[model samples]
Target: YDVISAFQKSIRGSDVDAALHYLARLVEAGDLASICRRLMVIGYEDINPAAAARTVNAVLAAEKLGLPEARIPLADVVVDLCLSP
Candidate 1:
């Protein structure tokens, strides 16, 4: 959970590289699903409160695309969230 907290803080602080690196740690630990959940929640709670629906749509698309392959969309959304608010 340390990584998750660090990752969220990085995003909150607009530290793109740090945020993505922490995300990589989560992904390496086989916690991509957790990342997804965190991203979605963060999307509304912090990133862009008005764009939660877009986050949902992106997540659905990522799910359909499947893992490893799904990482791109997930990463892109994370970046979006970091830049949004």
Candidate 2:
């Protein structure tokens, strides 16, 4: 699917802006929660575990705070986490 393709590319490219944009699109479509869960699995099994934890925290924060207050902070956290080590 276009969405997943975009998501993977964005993640692989380490483009936080693009990743966040794709994530927002998914969130707007009401599929972000499921996607987040899937990403957590993928992150643990195929990607970075520490990054996965950061992502999980972002998703949980988003769920609690909603997009308006969540996007930038979460994106920043993800970028920082992914680049940390």
Candidate 3:
């Protein structure tokens, strides 16, 4: 929750660096599935409903696509969430 809150708050403020930094903490924690779950909620509760699906899609695809490379896509959507506000 701590990492998610930081990441979410960062994303809300469009603080790209800190958002991704906290997100990376979650990623490094070896539970991006949880990351996606939390992001899905934010996408719906805090922003566009469309983003909820997109966020989940990005993470699910990333699950198969692998990290280093995968973080790129996930990061894209994270900022996408930030952009609306």
Candidate 4:
């Protein structure tokens, strides 16, 4: 609830940076599936699906290199390395 609130608020205000940050927190906290479900709500609720998709694409860029959103997930890989052998 708290995570979704902050993320939605950020998106509403056009603060994509904050939205991405909050979303990354949710993903890191094991809420990946939760976010996927809410994305459906975001589209149905008319909260600018284009904007939501844009922000989501940015966050999911974790696996897509060569894109501008590519920069957002760079640190995430660092964290992953810190946890693995």
Candidate 5:
């Protein structure tokens, strides 16, 4: 739950750097895909839908601001993020 906790804070705070950092962690642990779906369920299904959309937009902005080296895997999840809306 470490990754989920960290990831959720970054999303709530809209912290791009933090979000990008943990995103790599998620990717490395092979939990990126699962977490993406899980977060959507939490954010949209079990929680606030508007906040979920906002978080995704924040992540999208994070992806754009992220460095090229880190942006690739972020692209994979950002695609999923945008789909929440």
Candidate 6:
């Protein structure tokens, strides 16, 4: 998928803004579940495993809690995940 490819490229390039931008686009377009699944693969295989767990938890919480409360904290967690060593 073009979107997934773009997402991988963004992450590989270490472009946090671009990665989140595409993530939001996917979420807003109703593709977040699929994207989140793919993120699991990327996290385990590409990014830090510890950070991946945090990211996955954040995504799950967002899905469970709804956008009003989930978005800000999820975004914050994701930023930390992305920046992890």
Alpha-carbon shift of residue 20 in model 6 (angstroms): 1.7
Instruction: List runs of model 3 lying over 4 Å from the truth.
Output: 66-68
Per-residue lDDT of candidate 5, residues 1-85 (tens digit)? 5876777666556465676677667766664445555555546643345666754654454445544343464544443443433
Clashing pairs in 1: none
TM-score of each: 0.83, 0.60, 0.78, 0.50, 0.48, 0.72
Candidate 2 stretches greater than 4 Å from native:
77-85
Q: Per model, state how many residue pairs clash.
A: 0, 0, 0, 0, 0, 0
**For residues 15-78, what per-residue lDDT tens digits would candidate 1 score against the true structure?**
8899888876776777567777888878878854556668787788778886667777877877
Q: Where does candidate 2 have its weakest 10-residue lDDT segment?
A: 76-85
Task: State the lDDT of candidate 2 residue by residue for 4-84, as single tens digits.
Answer: 667656666667778777767766676555665655654564455567677677678766877566565456654654354
Off by over 4 Å in 5: 42-85
C-alpha-based local distance difference test score of model 5: 0.55
Candidate 1 stretches with Cα past 4 Å from truth are none
- Pick by TM-score: 4 or 5, better one: 4
Best-fitting candidate, scored by lDDT: 1
The number of residue pairs in model 3 that clash at the backbone is: 0
lDDT of 3 by residue, 1-85 (tens): 5777888888778787888888777777767677777777777877766776787788777778775566777788888888865
Q: What is the C-alpha lDDT of each candidate?
A: 0.77, 0.63, 0.77, 0.50, 0.55, 0.67
Give lDDT tens digits, candidate 6, residues 1-85. Answer: 6877787677766678987887777666665566666666666666756787776786787778765555554556546646656
Ranking by TM-score: 1, 3, 6, 2, 4, 5
What does candidate 3 score on TM?
A: 0.78
| Comparison by lDDT, 2 against 4, better one | 2
- Shift in Å, residue 37, candidate 4: 1.7
